[PDB]
Design a protein around this nucleic acid. Structure first.
Ligand code: MN
Ligand code: MN
Ligand code: MN
Length: 430
DNA sequence: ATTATGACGCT
DNA sequence: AGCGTCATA
């Protein structure tokens, strides 16, 4: 009754850029705008690997992870932009810099948690209390929410899509009680008004469009964001959760897309998020561990407490390259040449980071993969990072991996290396 | 031969 | 510490 936590204490948003690397390339090259377009890395192997796809191109069935040669079969007029290559490798700097543009705009509104290169969470609880106080029990007009969907509406007693959005919004606003500054539905709505403003600013100041979700926690905000992409935002209320979850595949919720989610489905013999409500907290804990079980017990009821971390900057800076198939590194000087290439990119990015962000990395992580290993990393070793020097860093990396070579003679490397990875970590203020 | 990342959890 | 899981362009 009066003591049941409902997890409606916060207003959290997730803002996620639409087809982000594609938009970055479309801004730069107007010829790619409003076309089936994709971003590709490399070219030689089957036309290159697609890592971002415009919504026009998705209509033809083009997806991420597709080889460009295969995508061309679905969509002959597909336009392509290539990821930059520097020092023999893909270099993602243009996209990291475009990300910073967006993160700095979002930070004007609230402390953000950078969750990826193209998305951040915002805790808008405080900002909502402020906007409510100036509102002065003013109703919220539909015109203040021009791109917002209310999940689950319209419902009950027009065949166009924008018509449907407006009808749902009208029902939502009609039902609102703007008289109560502590009403969670009202707070979400004011949250959505602020996110319209945030999104307008992003687009005005960068040219990039984005989508967003507004809810009471990060997981619901993330899920909400995806419901009406592209270029729209979606409000998922506490009350909308039972219907939403009653047909929502478990794998759709963040963190459940892998082995754990598969095990929830297998062990409990269920399919949808809402079916989880029929288990006790102890029952879920028994199968999935203390932390996961409690998290599942609350999550299936729309409740989650994971805070929005105040972290706008990535806490690691890394450089990685695969050496597939026959390109696997089989000689010493090969290994040393590529460690230098990686190390030089790292030094470049590290030095820029120190200047911009007043910090220094203190640990260097070196990872490799060896042929045969299904695993993604075969081996990970750390050493001190005391100087931003590429030659020192590459020499040190070699030192930590020197012994992995199984060949008797030292000139050859075996078994051949199919991946090198250098990561700077453990930052301290400077 | 999707690749290049980046965060968090376990022991 | 090193490994594993999950995620995101
Ligand atoms: Mn995106
Ligand atoms: Mn994203
Ligand atoms: Mn995506």
């Amino acid at each position: 009754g009066p003591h049941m936590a409902t997890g409606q204490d916060r207003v959290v948003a997730l803002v996620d850029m639409d087809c982000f690397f594609v938009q970055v390339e479309q801004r730069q090259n107007p010829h790619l705008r409003n076309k089936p377009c994709a971003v590709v890395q490399y070219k030689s192997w089957k036309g290159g690997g697609i890592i971002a796809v415009s919504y026009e191109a998705r209509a033809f069935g083009v997806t991420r992870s597709m080889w460009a040669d295969d995508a061309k079969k679905l969509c002959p007029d597909l336009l392509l932009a290539q990821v930059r290559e520097s020092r023999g490798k893909a270099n993602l700097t243009k996209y990291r810099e475009a990300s910073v543009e967006v993160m700095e705009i979002m930070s004007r509104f609230a402390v953000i948690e950078r969750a990826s290169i193209d998305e951040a969470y915002v805790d808008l609880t405080s900002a909502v209390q402020e906007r409510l106080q100036k509102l002065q029990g003013q109703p919220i007009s539909a015109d203040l929410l021009p791109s917002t969907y209310i999940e689950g509406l319209p419902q009950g007693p027009t065949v166009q899509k924008e018509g449907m959005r407006k009808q749902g919004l009208f029902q939502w606003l009609d039902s609102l009680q703007i008289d109560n500054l502590t009403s969670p539905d009202l707070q979400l709505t004011v949250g959505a008004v602020i996110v319209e403003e945030m999104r307008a600013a992003i687009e005005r100041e960068t040219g990039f469009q984005c989508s967003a979700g507004i809810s009471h926690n990060k997981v619901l905000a993330k899920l909400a964001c995806g419901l009406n992409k592209p270029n729209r935002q979606t409000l998922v209320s506490h009350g909308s959760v039972p219907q939403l979850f009653s047909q929502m595949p478990i794998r759709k919720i963040r963190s459940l897309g892998g082995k754990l989610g598969a095990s929830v489905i297998e062990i409990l013999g269920i399919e949808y998020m809402g079916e989880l409500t029929q288990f006790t907290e102890s029952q879920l804990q028994s199968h999935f561990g203390e932390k996961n079980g409690s998290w599942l017990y609350a999550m299936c009821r729309g409740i989650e407490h994971d805070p929005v971390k105040p972290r706008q900057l990535p806490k690691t800076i890394g450089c990685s390259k695969n050496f597939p198939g026959k390109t696997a590194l089989a000689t010493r000087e090969q290994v040393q040449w590529w460690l230098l290439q990686l190390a030089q990119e790292l030094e470049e990015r590290l030095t820029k980071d120190r200047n911009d962000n007043d910090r220094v990395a203190t640990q260097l992580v070196v990872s490799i993969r060896v042929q045969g290993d299904k695993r993604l990393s075969s081996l990970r070793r750390c050493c001190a990072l005391t100087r931003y020097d590429a030659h020192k860093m590459s020499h040190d990396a070699f030192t930590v991996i020197k012994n992995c070579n199984t060949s008797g003679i030292q000139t050859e490397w075996s078994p051949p290396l199919t991946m090198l990875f250098l990561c700077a970590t453990k930052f301290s203020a400077s």
